[PDB]
Curated annotation (Swiss-Prot), chain B:
It comes from Saccharomyces cerevisiae (strain ATCC 204508 / S288c) (Baker's yeast). This is U3 small nucleolar ribonucleoprotein protein IMP3. Component of a heterotrimeric complex containing IMP3, IMP4 and MPP10. Interacts with MPP10. Component of the ribosomal small subunit (SSU) processome composed of at least 40 protein subunits and snoRNA U3. The keyword rRNA-binding applies. One of its GO terms (molecular function) is rRNA binding.
From Swiss-Prot, chain C:
Its main location: nucleus. It is found in: Nucleus, Nucleolus. Required for the early cleavages at sites A0, A1 and A2 during 18S ribosomal pre-RNA processing. This is U3 small nucleolar ribonucleoprotein protein IMP4. The keyword Ion transport does not apply. It holds the Pfam family Brix. One of its GO terms (cellular component) is Mpp10 complex. It comes from the Eukaryota. Changing residue 186 to A: Loss of RNA binding. Component of a heterotrimeric complex containing IMP3, IMP4 and MPP10. Interacts with MPP10. Component of the ribosomal small subunit (SSU) processome composed of at least 40 protein subunits and snoRNA U3. The gene is IMP4. The keyword Ribonucleoprotein applies.
UniProtKB/Swiss-Prot annotation, chain E:
Interacts with snoRNA U3. Interacts with MPP10. Interacts (via WD repeats) with UTP18. Component of the ribosomal small subunit (SSU) processome composed of at least 40 protein subunits and snoRNA U3. The WD repeats are grouped into two tandem seven-bladed beta-propeller regions. It comes from Saccharomyces cerevisiae (strain ATCC 204508 / S288c). It is found in: Nucleus, Nucleolus. WD repeats lie at residues 19-58, 67-101, 109-145, 150-185, 187-228, 230-268. This is U3 small nucleolar RNA-associated protein 21. Present with 2020 molecules/cell in log phase SD medium. Involved in nucleolar processing of pre-18S ribosomal RNA and ribosome assembly. The gene is UTP21. It comes from the Eukaryota.
Curated annotation (Swiss-Prot), chain F:
CDD domains: WD40. The gene is PWP2. GO terms for biological process: endonucleolytic cleavage in 5'-ETS of tricistronic rRNA transcript (SSU-rRNA, 5.8S rRNA, LSU-rRNA); endonucleolytic cleavage in ITS1 to separate SSU-rRNA from 5.8S rRNA and LSU-rRNA from tricistronic rRNA transcript (SSU-rRNA, 5.8S rRNA, LSU-rRNA); endonucleolytic cleavage to generate mature 5'-end of SSU-rRNA from (SSU-rRNA, 5.8S rRNA, LSU-rRNA); establishment of cell polarity; maturation of SSU-rRNA; maturation of SSU-rRNA from tricistronic rRNA transcript (SSU-rRNA, 5.8S rRNA, LSU-rRNA); ribosomal small subunit assembly; septum digestion after cytokinesis. It comes from the Eukaryota. Present with 16700 molecules/cell in log phase SD medium. Belongs to the WD repeat PWP2 family. It is found in: Nucleus, Nucleolus. This is Periodic tryptophan protein 2.
Length: 49, 175, 256, 86, 318, 792
């Protein structure tokens, strides 16, 4: 919804610091993507071979 | 109601409270006056549909596909064995055609029973079977494949005395 | 299944009688096509639709000459399969090939290793053409010329006049495979004269100016002495055409 | 086509307003009626030739809702489109 | 079937009192489905339930020992008879014919059972040994031996667990697949008259000669209930539906019926028997953690299609 | 394992009667013919009641506090159940045709429009123990001349409106004093009165006509009683009002008509808020939420039902069951979806988590004879009697290819290549196996060798060959790749009509007309062995029968079979009233379920009390989740399940293996031995306790030292729990530990670890993939919106 306006007002400092913190939390959370890629691929390997 | 005499008859000719129905019922052993009425109503419906599809313009692919659909549908049913004409549907479909397509006429045709009424009785007793499943109502039109695949039910006294007359009993199949 | 096949044979005889009366009606209505101004049923069903399949078979306990000869028959015929009929019977044989689903059968008969008889049956309750083949010249007999190209050959019919000849050319057209290449470089001939059809394989090329052929394969004269409506395992079905050997005009009448 | 030699039902204003405003509605209604009749007759034959129970087929403006969806109802058209086909 | 005479008195009389009984309903209305070992007979009579009649078979023990136990095959085709001398005769119920005869025990066989697979067979006589057998074969799997003599055996095919009211006033539960005792129940101050599994096999209800009826939860192995009866119950049975309990007392010509508040409500599992005479553990259900650890990531408590609803809701509008 | 609880019925979402709501509105109760359907709305869950009915359902009502439910059929048979135990308390016999049933707003009694009389009966208590005769009558009102067609409670439990075909609306009361106050009549009306309703201030009475006339009486002045204060009129040509619902506190009216048209009004101003149509068929029943936001319109002519919210204007659901019958069944390769196909050519595909008809297809015109899949969750196949078969998407949801024969022969049976390269269809009139390649779209071949129609087709996916069972009493196995095209025929003793293969692909089960289901080793083509079925068949008697149900050869065989995915159990269903479950190694049956008890159906009674619809098990199938199995029959889709899990089936117990000893092992921090005892006792709440108990750093050590015996069970459990668990990080740590523990073991024993991996890998793709997609889109959308230059 509010992505067009937030891109318009991108490079504003307050929202910039806030999205910095958001992406801090996101790069903390990335391990779940990592691990599900792991277990999914290897479960496929076991179920195939 | 009283077999009215001459003067009262010419006065009241039209009053009656009570014959192809009884004709096919006697020659073809049909069950019901309403069975004949249903078949005859059906034939009139088909003739009306022939009227309507002919009123549809002849250079119409819809008309030709629905025409051949009705043709091969009624053929695979069995009421006509030809597929070529349109006069065959506008004329030859009869109460007698659907009546010989009926089951006990086919039993009497394949000589399952000697008589059509005994075929009906065998139908009631369930001593027959129609492909996968046995049957109990004579009011049945049989598709051509099931006509090829209809017979007696297994371990029946009738088929057993068939194999007894032929002296070929095989009790392994409880025949 | 006995009831089924009997119903199909009854419908076959009925359809042939219907084709018969329609053909007489066609001879009747031939007079009005000039005043103002067709394949068979069982070959109309699969004229150019389905590729045929033919089983060639010996009669029984054959000679090596008949073995190699039926082998050459297979070599000339696309989609042809050999059969060494050993302790096989006619009904179970035809029924087993009907079970497999087959187009045409050609079984061979002889005398002292000399092939002299060939019968072709159409398997969907079709007609049978009974020939006496005599003047057999085999490639095995002549030379090691190599091998056949085995491309779908071209067909050349000659001197087919009567409607009997029309039924014949229908049957042979349909036994050979449908939809040939325009540049099919082997050609077969069907040369008729004096009621003696005779055939040779011919590969061919066009020159810089004209055409050039090579006769190859077999070479002989056969003659249809019978045509029956039913199949051969009948031996009792109604004959569609019978040869009259014991008649007045026998050495003179053509197409009979 | 062919013309008619009876009196015209409509006036000049009526035909001109008609023109001033499916192959044809007559062919549409004919297709519709013969379709319902064929449905009923196929139903009758299924009754007469059925071993198992078969009920009637069916029963033969305003905003109206379509219950049965031939799609999961939440998929975009661009999503169901294949990239090759676009 | 032979048409010969029957050897008996001319006047009629009823059959002796039924000391053992088995019944099945696999093939009901086809051949015999009830076997009744009467008082002091070397034979057991057959009975048809649907006809409400005697059936045409009676299985002798052939060892001149009285039939002490009867058992019916779950398919209803076989009848096992444990006699007074250890003989385990096996019959076909269809034709009432003698099929097999196992011989391990020397005492009175006082309990016989077969699996639901018609494969293994557990037997028990007064000498205290337990015989494990292949009925598909004709072999001996195992021969357990206990301390006391054996009184009563109850088999539970849905768990393949069989409990035993012994002579030392205990109920020993034994697994058949591992072929070893799994549970032992102490507390019955007198002879255990009757005992039964739950339909789910979670409890066992036992009436015992100290005017007691005790319900035991076998998971924890704890007596979760004890009632003292005025009329000592001789027969205690669960209903096939897990809803009722049927008791024959020693007095009164009828059978008392018991409705199941445990069927209509949860039950605490507390050994309260000797007291009269972790709540998730008491109620045998465990609620999950909301979040086990802060590092653990947890999701919606409920539906999960809410995600697509949020992302694909406006398209649902369109 | 051999125990199975009937989980749910899908198809025919509404059949017959009043559909009612819950108090909180978060559940719906829709009456199917012999059961009632619980509809959890917040989490989108379905539930079917497990109790049968004597016949088709006539009237139902639910307690105000959500505790009791009465359900009267057309015979007075009134089943009273408790909800929280989901248990039948009573089955009373009101011995007259009961029309309308209405709980009191105080709950101590109820009113009953049964015939022309108003029955009023008090209530026993639910916390009370079971009694013998708890049904107690309170009042009988008989001031009618024709049948009471509608009933209405007041806000208080005193005043009742009995609307009747006598053009009458009688105010009764449950007491003599308020009966003397208002036990009045209401006449002066059009054709019939359809309904009467109290006001919120209760000064006005609203009677809606069959004519479409709402008469608003009000206790006003002209010593003054029931002046018709206002008249309001619907304006339809032929559409007359069939079903009415009026919410007072939000003054709303819903009138569903005979033409699909439902009109929604506000009463005091009499404004048509809106008016829409469900279709060409009459609206039969309407129900309205307590808060009034939600409205249900169930119409039985096609069996459709729509729940809607007028506020946000949101169709919560717009579903419809199959018209005739679920002919063919199809689970999903993960199981999440199940396909049903009917006589119509309506192919309805459903999700099983939310047991909902996701979609349909109506491109086939005739009945779709079979429906199949490949070894991949993408593609569906529908073989019809049309003379065509059709290949469809289940992601773009589009037909790929309507393969046809030139003659368009009526294919019954069908099989598909596991990799999905070839499709074969087998008809009845031709019995020539037509085989098409997929991407070509054309047929490759039409195998012959079968004389007489082929009952069924199957593909051994492993060696990927075909078995074709035909009514020549034969099997014929074909190997068609590797230049082979070779044949193996098998004679059996009678005409086979059912065929299936082992999930490992070396044995095959077959059911013939005699009722015996044989098994054959394929490679030696030798009979493994048979199981009889002629005895354990509960076939039903017909009313037009002239023989017995015993001597009837009606359904003394089995028409559909399915293997356990272990290849050890069998679910068989034929034309009888039974669904049986056999065992392969002991060659014995395991279970028999009578499919339904209903005198409306034909083959149910065994001996009658001294055409019509008939019950037959069309198709049977197990679940790839291995926790349920479904059967499509003449009514729809039944699913039995093992999700009950309340049965003590432990594993090699000992004396010391008690649950408290297991908690002792936990507090002892002996987590390996604790989980060992948890699996030995085999009790899922305790297993969940230890699973949530033990810590992450010793998850890997415990997983390293778990025995291979408990290995497939712990895989299966972690699957069937983590699906409805949200601690996904935890669970993936667990899976990662176990896969690091034993991979090559599972690779050796792939057929052994069949059910485990399927359910587990399904759970990955069910939720975890989608969550991770949303994660990745969040990150990328961030990165783009941040890195890109601002405009202007």
């Amino acid at each position: 919804a509010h992505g067009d306006v937030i891109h318009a007002n991108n490079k504003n400092q307050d929202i910039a610091s806030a999205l910095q913190n958001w992406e801090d939390v996101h790069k903390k959370e990335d391990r779940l993507d990592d691990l599900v890629k792991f277990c999914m691929g290897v479960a496929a390997f076991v179920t195939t071979a | 109601v009283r077999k009215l005499k001459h003067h009262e008859q010419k006065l009241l000719k039209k009053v009656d409270f009570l014959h192809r129905d009884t004709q096919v019922m006697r020659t073809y052993h049909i069950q019901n006056r309403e069975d004949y009425h249903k078949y005859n109503r059906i034939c009139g419906d088909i003739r009306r549909l022939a009227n309507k599809l002919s009123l549809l313009p002849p250079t119409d692919p819809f008309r030709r596909k629905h025409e051949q659909l009705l043709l091969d549908k009624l053929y695979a049913m069995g009421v006509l064995t030809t597929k070529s004409k349109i006069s065959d549907l506008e004329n030859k479909v009869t109460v007698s055609a659907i009546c010989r397509r009926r089951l006990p006429v086919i039993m009497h045709r394949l000589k399952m029973a000697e008589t059509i009424q005994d075929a009906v009785k065998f139908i009631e007793q369930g001593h027959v079977r129609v492909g996968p499943n046995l049957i109990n109502d004579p009011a049945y039109l049989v598709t051509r494949n099931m006509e090829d695949y209809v017979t007696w039910v297994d371990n029946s006294k009738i088929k057993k005395t068939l194999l007894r007359y032929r002296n070929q009993i095989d009790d392994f199949d409880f025949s | 299944m006995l009831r089924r096949q009997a119903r199909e044979r009854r419908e076959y005889l009925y359809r042939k009688a219907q084709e018969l009366q329609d053909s007489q009606l066609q001879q009747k209505r031939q007079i009005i096509k000039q005043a103002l101004a067709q394949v068979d049923d069982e070959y109309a069903a699969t004229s150019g639709i389905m590729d045929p399949r033919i089983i060639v078979t010996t009669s029984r306990d054959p000679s090596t000459r008949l073995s190699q000869f039926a082998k050459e028959i297979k070599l000339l015929f696309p989609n042809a399969v050999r059969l060494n009929r050993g302790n096989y019977v006619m009904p179970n044989l035809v029924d087993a090939c009907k079970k497999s689903g087959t187009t045409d059968l050609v079984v061979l008969h002889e005398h002292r290793g000399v092939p002299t008889s060939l019968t072709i049956s159409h398997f969907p309750h079709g007609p049978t053409a009974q020939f006496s083949l005599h003047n057999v010249v085999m490639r095995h007999d002549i030379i090691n010329a190599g091998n056949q190209s085995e491309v779908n050959p071209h067909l050349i019919f000659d001197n087919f006049t009567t409607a009997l000849g029309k039924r014949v050319v229908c049957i042979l057209k349909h036994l050979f495979n449908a939809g040939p290449k325009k540049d099919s470089e082997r050609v077969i001939t069907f040369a008729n004269r004096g009621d003696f059809i005779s055939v040779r394989q011919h590969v061919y090329v066009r020159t810089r100016e004209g055409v050039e052929i090579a006769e190859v394969g077999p070479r002989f004269e056969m003659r249809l002495f019978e045509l029956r409506l039913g199949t051969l395992e009948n031996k009792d079905a109604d004959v569609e055409w019978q040869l009259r050997r014991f008649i007045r005009t026998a050495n003179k009448k053509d197409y009979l | 086509f062919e013309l008619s030699d009876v009196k015209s039902s409509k006036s000049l204003a009526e035909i001109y307003e008609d023109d001033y405003t499916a192959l044809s509605e007559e062919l549409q209604k004919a297709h519709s009626e013969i379709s319902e009749l064929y449905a009923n007759l196929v139903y009758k034959l299924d009754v007469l030739s059925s071993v198992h129970f078969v009920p009637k087929p069916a029963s033969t403006e305003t905003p109206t809702i379509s219950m049965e969806d031939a799609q999961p109802l939440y998929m975009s058209n661009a999503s169901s489109l294949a990239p090759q086909e676009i | 079937q032979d048409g010969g005479r029957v050897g008996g008195s001319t006047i009629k009389s009823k059959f002796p009192e039924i000391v053992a009984l088995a019944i099945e309903n696999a093939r009901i209305g086809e051949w015999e489905n009830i076997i009744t070992a009467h008082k002091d007979e070397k034979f057991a009579r057959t009975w048809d339930m649907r006809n409400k009649r005697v059936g045409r078979w009676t299985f002798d023990t052939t060892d001149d020992g009285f039939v002490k136990s009867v058992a019916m095959s779950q398919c209803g085709n076989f009848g096992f008879i444990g006699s007074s001398n250890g003989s385990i005769t096996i019959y076909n119920m269809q034709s009432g014919i003698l099929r097999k005869k196992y011989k391990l025990h020397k005492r009175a066989v006082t309990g016989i059972s077969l699996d639901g697979m018609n494969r293994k067979m557990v037997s028990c006589g007064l000498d205290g040994i337990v015989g494990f057998y292949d009925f598909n074969k004709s072999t001996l799997l195992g021969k357990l031996k206990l301390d006391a003599p054996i009184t009563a055996m109850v088999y539970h095919r849905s768990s393949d667990l069989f409990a035993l009211a012994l002579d030392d006033l205990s109920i020993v539960v034994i697994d058949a697949v591992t072929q070893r005792v799994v549970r032992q129940l102490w507390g019955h101050s007198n002879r255990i008259t009757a005992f039964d599994f739950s339909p789910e096999g979670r409890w066992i209800v036992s009436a015992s000669l100290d005017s007691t009826i005790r319900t035991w939860d076998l998971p924890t192995g704890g007596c979760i209930d004890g009632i003292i009866v005025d009329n000592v119950a001789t027969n205690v049975k669960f209903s096939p539906n897990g809803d009722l309990l049927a008791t024959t007392h020693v007095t009164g010509n009828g059978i008392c019926i018991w409705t199941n508040r445990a069927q209509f409500k949860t039950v605490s599992t507390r050994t309260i028997d000797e007291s009269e005479f972790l709540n998730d553990i008491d109620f045998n259900t465990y609620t999950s953690l909301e979040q086990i650890d802060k590092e653990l990531l947890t999701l919606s408590i409920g539906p999960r299609s809410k995600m697509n609803t949020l992302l694909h809701l406006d398209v649902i509008r369109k | 394992k051999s125990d199975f609880k009937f989980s749910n019925l899908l198809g025919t979402v509404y059949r017959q009667g009043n559909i009612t709501f819950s108090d909180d509105g978060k559940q719906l109760l829709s009456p199917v013919g012999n059961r009632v359907s619980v509809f959890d709305l917040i989490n989108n869950k379905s539930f079917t009641f497990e109790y049968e009915h004597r016949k088709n359902i006539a009237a139902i009502d639910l307690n105000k506090q959500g505790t009791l439910l009465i359900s009267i059929d057309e015979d007075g048979r009134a089943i009273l159940v408790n909800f929280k135990a989901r248990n039948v308390l009573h089955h009373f016999n009101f011995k007259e045709k009961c029309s309308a049933v209405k709980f009191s707003p105080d709950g101590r009694l109820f009113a009953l429009a049964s015939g022309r009389f108003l029955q009023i009966w008090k209530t026993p208590d639910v916390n009370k123990d079971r009694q013998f005769a708890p049904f107690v009558r309170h009042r009988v009102h008989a001031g009618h001349f024709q049948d009471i067609t509608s009933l209405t409670w007041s806000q208080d439990s005193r005043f009742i409106l009995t609307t009747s075909k006598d053009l009458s609306a009688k105010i009764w009361s449950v007491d003599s004093e308020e009966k003397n106050l208002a036990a009045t009549t209401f006449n002066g009306h059009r054709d019939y009165v359809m309904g009467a309703f109290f006001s919120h201030d209760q000064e006005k009475i609203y009677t809606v006509s069959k004519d479409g006339a709402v008469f608003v009486w009000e206790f006003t002045k002209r010593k003054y009683s029931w002046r018709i204060t206002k008249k309001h009129f619907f304006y339809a040509n032929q559409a007359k009002v069939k079903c009415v619902t009026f919410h007072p506190a939000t003054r709303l009216l819903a009138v569903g008509f005979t033409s699909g048209e439902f009109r929604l009004y506000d009463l005091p101003d009499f404004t048509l808020i809106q008016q829409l149509s469900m279709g060409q068929n009459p609206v039969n029943t309407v129900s309205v939420n307590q808060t009034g936001e939600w409205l249900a319109f169930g119409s039985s002519k096609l069996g459709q039902l729509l729940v809607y919210e007028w506020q946000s204007e949101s169709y919560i659901l717009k579903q419809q069951g199959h018209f005739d019958s679920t002919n063919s069944l199809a689970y999903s390769p993960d199981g999440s979806r199940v396909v049903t196909a009917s006589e119509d050519g309506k192919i309805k595909v459903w999700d099983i988590t939310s047991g909902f008809c996701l979609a349909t297809f109506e491109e086939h015109t005739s009945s779709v004879t079979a429906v199949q899949f490949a070894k991949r969750g993408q593609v569906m196949f529908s073989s019809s009697l049309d003379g065509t078969v059709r290949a469809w998407d289940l992601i773009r949801y589009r037909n790929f290819r309507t393969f046809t024969g030139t003659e368009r022969i009526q294919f019954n049976c069908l099989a598909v290549d596991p990799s999905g390269e070839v499709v074969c269809a087998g008809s009845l009139d031709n019995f020539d196996i037509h085989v098409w390649s997929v991407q070509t779209g054309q047929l490759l071949d039409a195998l012959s060798g079968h004389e007489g129609p082929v009952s069924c087709l199957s593909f051994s996916q492993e060696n990927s060959v075909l078995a074709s069972a035909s009514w020549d009493k034969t099997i014929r196995i074909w190997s068609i790749f590797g230049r082979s095209q070779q044949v193996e025929p098998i004679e059996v003793y009678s005409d086979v009509l059912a065929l299936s293969m082992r999930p490992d692909g070396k044995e095959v089960a077959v059911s013939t007309l005699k009722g015996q289901i044989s098994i054959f080793n394929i490679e030696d083509a030798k009979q493994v062995g048979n199981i009889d079925c002629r005895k354990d068949i509960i076939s039903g008697r017909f009313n037009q029968d002239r023989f017995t149900a015993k001597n009837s050869e009606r359904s003394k065989f089995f028409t559909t079979i399915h293997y356990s995915f272990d290849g050890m159990a069998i679910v068989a269903g034929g034309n009888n009233n039974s669904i049986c479950l056999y065992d392969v190694p002991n060659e014995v049956l395991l279970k028999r379920f009578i499919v339904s008890r209903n005198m409306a159906l034909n083959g149910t009674l065994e001996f009658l009390n001294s055409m019509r619809p008939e019950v037959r098990v069309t198709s049977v199938q197990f679940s790839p989740t291995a926790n349920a199995f479904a059967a499509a029959s003449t009514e729809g889709l039944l699913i039995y399940s093992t999700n009950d899990t309340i049965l003590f089936d432990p594993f090699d117990l000992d004396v010391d293996v008690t649950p408290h000893s297991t908690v002792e092992a936990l507090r002892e921090k002996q987590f390996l031995n604790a989980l060992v005892m948890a699996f030995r006792l085999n009790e899922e709440y305790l297993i969940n306790k230890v699973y949530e108990a033990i810590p992450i750093k010793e998850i890997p050590l415990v997983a390293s030292n778990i025995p291979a015996i408990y290995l497939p069970r712990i895989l299966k459990f972690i699957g069937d729990f983590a699906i409805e668990s949200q601690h996904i990080e935890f669970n993936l740590i667990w899976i990662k530990a176990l896969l690091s523990a034993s991979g090559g073991y599972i690779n050796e024993h792939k057929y052994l670890f069949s059910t485990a991996m399927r359910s587990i890998q399904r759970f990955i793709v069910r939720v975890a993939k989608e969550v991770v997609n949303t994660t990745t889109d969040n990150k990328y959308t961030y990165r783009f919106l941040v890195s890109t230059d601002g405009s202007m």
